[PDB]
Amino acid sequence: VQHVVIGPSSLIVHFNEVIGRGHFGCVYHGTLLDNDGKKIHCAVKSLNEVSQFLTEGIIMKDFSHPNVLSLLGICLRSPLVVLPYMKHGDLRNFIRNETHNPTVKDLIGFGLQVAKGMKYLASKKFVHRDLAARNCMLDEKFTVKVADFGLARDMYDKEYDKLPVKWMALESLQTQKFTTKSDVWSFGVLLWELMTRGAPPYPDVNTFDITVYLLQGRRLLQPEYCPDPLYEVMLKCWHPKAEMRPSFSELVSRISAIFSTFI
Ligand SMILES: CN1CCC(COc2cnc(-c3cccc(Cn4nc(-c5cccc(C#N)c5)ccc4=O)c3)nc2)CC1
């Protein structure tokens, strides 16, 4: 924690500007100062046991990838988690917004960015457990950051019942076993959210019903603007046998090929 401590004098937290709400606390717009006096935009996560949470999440300072959320630091005083501000907020609200019009290629490009971030996390043997479009952020350059892990972990939406059962693999619903292969299943649902522009998966299925539903021989339907090879990728992500699901390295390779076919 020593190398990532932020002095309370160097942090301005705007408690009036709430930009996110979670069960553990709120996200606020903040301001950090650099050695030269330049203001850096923050997202300050509040935390309301605490030592255990910081112990579990301090591994995030060692992660560094352009598609993975980084940690700016921790302000000790209840501790505050300092994260980089993500101008366009969460990926799900972005694709449901009406100020921007992402093309089918842009949506596939967002999925490819997530797959690159996940490929990095899987190479570090890190299992996300809650991969979903609501849990990825978009910065000022429209770069996707896989977020909601370590110190940033929280439930930021009401899509839990708490577990995100509609994004969970069949073996995780049955035995509560989470692996990189169950993150590949969640990644499939995330591609489907991207291709439907943020539609809720299985809308007429109650969260308690999902296991029986999947076991009947059912999967999410192909969205109307989803290319066939991308729907095949989603179907491979949802393979009933975890070991038969593509790796994130294979997903990056395959999705980059599909992305390249669009003008
Ligand atoms: C209209 N609105 C005004 C504010 C604008 C900027 O808002 C921002 C909101 N949040 C951050 C931020 C950055 C780094 C880390 C986190 C923590 N974190 N939060 C979420 C999160 C936040 C809000 C809603 C939902 C959901 N569902 C999910 C997911 C994963 C995660 O790790 C938050 N930055 C900017 C966007 C447009």
Resolution (in Å) of the shown entry? 2.1
CA 19 to chain centre: 16
Q: Determination technique for this PDB entry?
A: X-ray
Is 21 one of the annotated binding-site residues?
Answer: yes
Cα angle 174, 175, 181; round to 5 = 90
Say which DSSP state 62 is in: G
Say which DSSP state 261 is in: T
The burial class, CB within 10 Å (0-12 / 13-18 / 19+), for 147 is buried
Say which DSSP state 244 is in: G
List the one residue out of 8, 80, 90 whose CA is nearest residue 44: 80
Place of tokens 């940033």: 152
19 lines ligand 1 (CB under 6 A): yes
Fold classification of 5-84 (topology level) = Phosphorylase Kinase; domain 1 (3.30.200)
CA distance 47 to 11: 16
Q: In this structure, which residue's CA is closest to atom 8 in ligand 1?
A: 89
Cβ proximity of 152 and 81 under 8 Å: yes
Domain ranges of the chain: 5-84, 89-261
Strand runs labelled E in the chain: 5-6, 11-21, 26-33, 39-46, 73-75, 80-84, 136-138, 144-146
Which ligand 1 atom sits closest to the C-alpha of 45?
17
CA distance 196 to 208: 23
Which ligand 1 atom sits closest to the C-alpha of 157?
27
Q: In this structure, which residue's CA is closest to atom 18 in ligand 1?
A: 148
CA distance 83 to 86: 9
Q: 82: part of which helix (H) or strand (E)?
A: strand 80-84
CA distance 162 to 164: 7
Class of domain 89-261: mainly alpha
Q: State in Å: Cα 203 to ligand 1 middle.
A: 24
Helices (H) and strands (E) counted in the chain, each on its own, are: 8, 8
